[PDB]
Design a protein around this ligand. Structure first.
Ligand SMILES: Nc1ncnc2c1ncn2[C@@H]1O[C@H](COP(=O)(O)OP(=O)(O)O)[C@@H](O)[C@H]1O
Ligand SMILES: Nc1ncnc2c1ncn2[C@@H]1O[C@H](COP(=O)(O)OS(=O)(=O)O)[C@@H](O)[C@H]1O
Ligand SMILES: Nc1ncnc2c1ncn2[C@@H]1O[C@H](COP(=O)(O)OS(=O)(=O)O)[C@@H](O)[C@H]1O
Lengths: 182, 208
């Protein structure tokens, strides 16, 4: 198995983690590959527990996550990352770290702010509108959309399985996965 | 939720091994510069992958200190942070169901204890932590000094490299490591056998 990184980027509540979970599930079970998810839960309370949400801390959050994803890819696993990663320069630095190589598949999990705001599972968009949370991506901090993602998922009014199929189909056009199991 | 040890749990041997073998573990090598940690790690990975068919990945200065930890030096605070970050990365590999093998001096007992604790804790939502096997790769400093192609000990004694472990900074020897290897006047394969034999007493590996 050749490793690679599948880098999800998009607004808070765009559906990145949900997509990552289903993607990992299909990859492991249907293609028999090794995959591991890096997300807020296993990174921001551990390796990056010293970081907040200032621009500088987000630059460092992503810098570290990209180096860790590269280690997983180097280990021959598929690293699936699910972080807002709002700054294009940091995503490009992450891509270069891999390519200079290991494949880096950037997946833009795209929903308009309106859709994420109506989901608002943890009520953070409402807090951001009220000024309780400062510098909140999409409301009071920037989201720099990817210019050239390998996969662009219009992730609204869309079954998670259709979104995952879109990603797996892309990986197959590049031959990154073993043939599907019978 | 409140954690307890496997001993305190009353789970049987088959139950303990089944539960702790659901994911991976970390083999944490500690010892002086040039004590032989990375050498043992390469041979250990070779035997584990070859003879036992398990997945393992090595973390060492070459893949950590010029990437993730390129922002850190050798001050005490930077070594505390170097080890904290490595421990968290090794934990991710163990969580991913690989054997993480680390080869860092990790001179401070408090940092090795922090590394152990973050692995061993059963965090909310998981029922068990991840095993952490500390291996003291022990050689006298005189032996490490005879394994110094880059002359780091020489530079340390000359004052070119400040606070160098074993010469001008301390190495806090592990008091209770899982495995204590006296890695001199002993071929590497023998040291590795000592480590693998220990792993087998815990049942962490597929049958020989
Ligand atoms: N395709 C989808 N359609 C509608 N809701 C979704 C979809 N995918 C995820 N969600 C919902 O949106 C919320 C945010 O999803 P999540 O995966 O946690 O987002 P993110 O990781 O981008 O912050 C959740 O309540 C989730 O169940
Ligand atoms: N100011 C904030 N901006 C964006 N997300 C925030 C903020 N404060 C808390 N969060 C929470 O943290 C998650 C984003 O964390 P990351 O993906 O790690 O962000 S990133 O910008 O540094 O990539 C959101 O989904 C939300 O749960
Ligand atoms: N002051 C120093 N003390 C010990 N090793 C040093 C020092 N400066 C450079 N090194 C080099 O860095 C290696 C030790 O790096 P680490 O294992 O990452 O150290 S640790 O103390 O922070 O765990 C040594 O093998 C040596 O090549």
């Amino acid at each position: 198995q050749r490793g690679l990184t599948i880098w999800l980027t998009g607004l808070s509540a765009s559906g990145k983690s949900t997509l990552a979970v289903e993607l990992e599930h299909q990859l492991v079970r249907d293609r028999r590959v090794h995959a591991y998810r890096l997300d807020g839960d296993n990174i921001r309370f551990g390796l990056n527990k010293d970081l907040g949400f200032s621009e500088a801390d987000r630059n460092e959050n992503i810098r570290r996550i990209a180096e860790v994803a590269k280690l997983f890819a180097d280990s021959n696993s598929i690293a699936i990352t699910s972080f807002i990663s709002p700054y294009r320069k940091d995503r490009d630095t992450a891509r270069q770290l891999h390519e200079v190589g290991l494949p880096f598949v950037e997946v833009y999990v795209d929903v308009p702010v309106e859709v994420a705001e109506q989901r608002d599972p943890k009520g953070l968009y409402k807090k951001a509108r009220e000024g309780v949370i400062k510098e909140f991506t999409g409301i009071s901090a920037p989201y720099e959309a990817p210019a050239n993602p390998e996969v662009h998922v219009k992730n609204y009014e869309l079954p998670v399985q259709d979104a995952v199929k879109q990603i797996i189909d892309y990986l197959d056009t590049k031959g990154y996965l073993p043939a599907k199991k019978e």
